[PDB]
Design an enzyme around this catalytic site. Structure first.
Site, PDB file in Angstrom:
ATOM      1  N   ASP A 151      -7.277  -8.633  -3.799  1.00  0.00           N
ATOM      2  CA  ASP A 151      -7.729  -7.421  -3.271  1.00  0.00           C
ATOM      3  C   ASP A 151      -6.718  -6.723  -2.328  1.00  0.00           C
ATOM      4  OD1 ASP A 151      -8.334  -7.643  -0.403  1.00  0.00           O
ATOM      5  OD2 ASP A 151     -10.507  -8.310  -0.961  1.00  0.00           O
ATOM      6  N   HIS A 152      -7.021  -5.467  -1.828  1.00  0.00           N
ATOM      7  CA  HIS A 152      -5.822  -4.736  -1.172  1.00  0.00           C
ATOM      8  C   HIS A 152      -5.656  -5.408   0.236  1.00  0.00           C
ATOM      9  CE1 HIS A 152      -3.452  -1.136  -0.641  1.00  0.00           C
ATOM     10  NE2 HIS A 152      -4.188  -1.023   0.320  1.00  0.00           N
TER      11      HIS A 152
ATOM     12  N   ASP B  94      -7.291 -10.159   4.844  1.00  0.00           N
ATOM     13  CA  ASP B  94      -8.582 -10.457   4.502  1.00  0.00           C
ATOM     14  C   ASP B  94      -8.248 -11.938   3.823  1.00  0.00           C
ATOM     15  OD1 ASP B  94     -11.605 -10.022   3.875  1.00  0.00           O
ATOM     16  OD2 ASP B  94     -10.807 -10.763   2.041  1.00  0.00           O
ATOM     17  N   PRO B  95      -9.299 -13.001   4.205  1.00  0.00           N
ATOM     18  CA  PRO B  95      -8.841 -14.268   3.554  1.00  0.00           C
ATOM     19  C   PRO B  95      -9.172 -14.418   2.119  1.00  0.00           C
ATOM     20  CG  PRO B  95     -11.003 -14.057   4.737  1.00  0.00           C
ATOM     21  CD  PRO B  95     -10.126 -12.758   4.973  1.00  0.00           C
TER      22      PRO B  95
ATOM     23  N   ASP C 280      -8.501  -2.642  -6.392  1.00  0.00           N
ATOM     24  CA  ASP C 280      -8.306  -3.847  -5.516  1.00  0.00           C
ATOM     25  C   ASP C 280      -9.317  -3.531  -4.139  1.00  0.00           C
ATOM     26  OD1 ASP C 280      -6.990  -1.856  -4.225  1.00  0.00           O
ATOM     27  OD2 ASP C 280      -4.951  -3.062  -4.315  1.00  0.00           O
TER      28      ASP C 280
ATOM     29  N   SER D 299       0.774  -1.453   0.038  1.00  0.00           N
ATOM     30  CA  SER D 299      -0.038  -0.170  -0.067  1.00  0.00           C
ATOM     31  C   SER D 299       0.877   1.438  -0.111  1.00  0.00           C
ATOM     32  CB  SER D 299      -0.997  -0.020   1.344  1.00  0.00           C
ATOM     33  OG  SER D 299      -1.532   1.354   1.239  1.00  0.00           O
TER      34      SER D 299
ATOM     35  N   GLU E 168      -6.300  -8.682   0.945  1.00  0.00           N
ATOM     36  CA  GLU E 168      -6.188 -10.221   0.623  1.00  0.00           C
ATOM     37  C   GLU E 168      -4.581 -10.530   0.538  1.00  0.00           C
ATOM     38  OE1 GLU E 168      -8.566 -11.074  -2.562  1.00  0.00           O
ATOM     39  OE2 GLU E 168     -10.416 -11.912  -1.413  1.00  0.00           O
TER      40      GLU E 168
ATOM     41  N   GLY F 232     -15.743 -12.220  -3.414  1.00  0.00           N
ATOM     42  CA  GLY F 232     -14.716 -12.475  -2.611  1.00  0.00           C
ATOM     43  C   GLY F 232     -13.806 -11.290  -1.796  1.00  0.00           C
TER      44      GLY F 232
HETATM   45 CA   LIG Z   1     -11.550 -12.284   0.526  1.00  0.00          CA
END
Ligand SMILES: [Ca+2]
Ligand SMILES: [Zn+2]
Length: 391
Positions: free
Chosen positions: A354-355, A362-363, A314, A110, A357, A283
Site C-alpha cells: 500500500d501507499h 505502515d508495517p 494502494d 507519492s 507500506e 493488511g
Molecule cells: Ca500493513
C-alpha cells in the site's frame, strides 16, 4: 557500478526532515532508516524536506535551493500571480557539487514524483513566463528559470499520481485529507490534539506566512490551513493531486531526453466479482482501508474520464496513474525489459504494497523493504551515462 551519483530522497503531500518527528523517518518509518541503509551499503544518499501541502512549483523551487544553496526564489511572475512571497527560506545546500558539474539520482514517493519531474523540467528549460516577466518588469531572475542545468541523471517515482488521484473527488476530501495527516502523525507516535511547544512537523509555509502558533495543536492548525490559501488556491498540492490539475502539469512537464525515468506501481486491493469494484486487502493501513480505499475502488466519472481501469489502488492513489503521465502527456512509457532507457518511463512493474507500506510508515512483514530499495539503488548505480548503438 557504472556511476557514482548520490541518491536524493523526496516525499509527497506528507513528509518531513530527518530531524523532525522526534527522529521518526518518513523514509523507513517503523521499519528503520532507508537513507542510513543505503549509505551503509555504499550508496551515498541524502534526504530533501519540502512543503508537503505546497504546489509542485513551490516544492521545486525549494528543492533547488535546498540542493545548491541559497534563498528560495519562487519567481516574480509566479509570486505575483498567486499572491505569495517571492523569496522564502535560505538553505546551506546539500550538494554544492552540483554547480561544479555533478549529477543526482532522485527517488520520489507519492506526489514527490511530480516535484522531481518539474524540477528536471525547470532545470533543463527554465520558465519562459518567468524570463519574460523579468525583462518586462526589470526584476531579477533565479538561475532555475534560465534552463541549461543538467543536475539529474535519473528520476524514480514510487506510488506517484502522475495522472492525479480520484481521492480528491470525495465529498469530504478536505476533512479526510487532514485526517490522513493526523494518521501519519499517529504512526510516528505523535498526538494531534496536543499543543507542542517544540515544532514536530514543519509544513514550511513561509511563502504564505503560515505556521503553527504557541498553544495551538495540529488539529487546530489543520482547521486553519483548510481556510488558508495553501488549500483554497491553485498554487497548491491539492490542485496538483487532482486529475484536472495533474493533466495541466503533464501538459508542460515533459520527460527530458537526458534523464532516465523509472516508475513503480503499488496496489493493495482485490476485485469484487459482481460489482467490478476494488476493495482493500487484508493488511492495508487502517486509515486507507476504512476511509479512502472504498471510494478509490468504486468511483467512476464519465465526464472526468474515469472508468474501471482507475479502480485498482494502494489506498491513496489509483494504480492506473502510476506508471507515468498519460493524461495530457507526450511522454512514452515502456515495460521494463531488463534494459533501462533514457528519456522514457521504465515501468518497473506493480508491487503488492500500500501507499504507506512502501516507505515503511505502515508495517508489512511480508514486504522486504530493505531489499526493495537496495535493489533499486544498484539499478540506478548501473545506469550508463552515454549510450551507443549496437546490434
Ligand atoms: Ca500493513
Ligand atoms: Zn506558489
Amino acid at each position: 557500478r557504472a556511476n557514482d551519483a548520490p541518491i536524493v530522497l523526496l516525499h509527497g503531500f506528507t513528509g518531513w526532515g530527518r530531524e523532525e518527528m522526534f527522529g521518526f523517518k518518513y523514509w523507513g518509518g517503523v521499519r528503520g532508516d532507508i537513507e542510513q541503509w543505503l549509505n551503509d551499503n555504499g550508496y551515498r544518499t541524502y534526504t530533501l524536506a519540502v512543503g508537503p501541502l505546497s504546489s509542485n512549483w513551490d516544492r521545486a523551487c525549494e528543492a533547488y535551493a535546498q540542493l545548491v544553496g541559497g534563498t528560495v526564489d519562487y519567481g516574480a511572475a509566479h509570486a505575483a500571480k498567486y499572491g505569495h512571497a517571492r523569496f522564502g527560506r535560505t538553505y546551506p545546500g546539500l550538494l554544492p557539487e552540483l554547480k561544479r558539474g555533478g549529477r543526482i539520482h532522485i527517488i520520489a514517493h507519492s506526489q514527490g514524483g511530480q516535484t522531481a519531474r518539474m524540477l528536471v523540467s525547470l532545470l533543463e528549460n527554465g520558465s519562459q513566463e518567468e524570463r519574460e516577466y523579468a525583462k518586462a518588469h526589470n526584476v531579477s531572475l533565479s538561475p532555475l528559470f534560465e534552463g541549461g542545468h543538467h543536475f539529474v541523471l535519473s528520476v524514480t517515482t514510487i506510488a506517484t499520481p502522475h495522472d492525479g488521484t480520484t481521492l480528491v473527488n470525495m465529498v469530504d476530501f478536505t476533512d479526510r485529507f487532514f485526517d490522513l495527516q493526523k494518521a501519519v502523525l499517529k504512526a510516528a507516535a505523535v498526538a494531534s490534539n496536543v499543543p507542542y511547544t517544540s515544532q514536530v512537523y514543519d509544513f514550511k509555509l513561509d511563502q504564505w506566512g503560515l505556521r503553527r502558533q504557541p498553544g495551538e495543536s495540529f488539529d487546530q492548525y489543520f482547521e486553519r490551513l483548510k481556510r488558508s490559501p495553501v488549500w483554497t488556491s491553485t498554487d497548491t498540492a491539492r490542485y496538483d493531486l487532482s486529475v484536472p490539475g495533474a493533466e495541466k502539469l503533464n501538459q508542460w512537464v515533459k520527460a527530458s531526453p537526458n534523464t532516465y525515468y523509472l516508475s513503480f506501481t503499488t496496489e493493495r486491493t482485490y476485485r469484487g466479482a459482481l460489482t467490478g469494484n476494488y476493495y482493500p486487502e487484508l493488511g492495508m493501513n487502517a486509515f486507507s482501508a476504512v476511509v479512502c480505499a472504498p471510494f478509490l475502488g468504486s468511483y467512476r466519472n464519465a465526464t472526468l474520464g474515469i472508468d474501471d481501469r482507475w479502480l485498482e489502488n494502494d489506498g491513496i492513489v489509483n494504480a492506473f496513474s502510476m506508471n507515468g503521465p498519460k493524461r495530457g502527456s507526450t511522454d512514452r512509457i515502456v515495460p521494463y525489459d531488463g534494459t533501462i532507457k533514457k528519456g522514457v518511463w521504465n515501468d518497473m512493474g506493480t508491487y503488492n504494497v500500500d501507499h504507506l507500506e512502501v516507505i515503511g510508515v505502515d508495517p508489512n512483514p511480508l514486504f522486504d523493504i530493505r531489499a526493495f530499495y537496495l535493489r533499486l539503488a544498484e539499478q540506478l548505480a548501473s545506469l550508463q551515462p552515454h549510450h551507443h548503438h549496437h546490434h
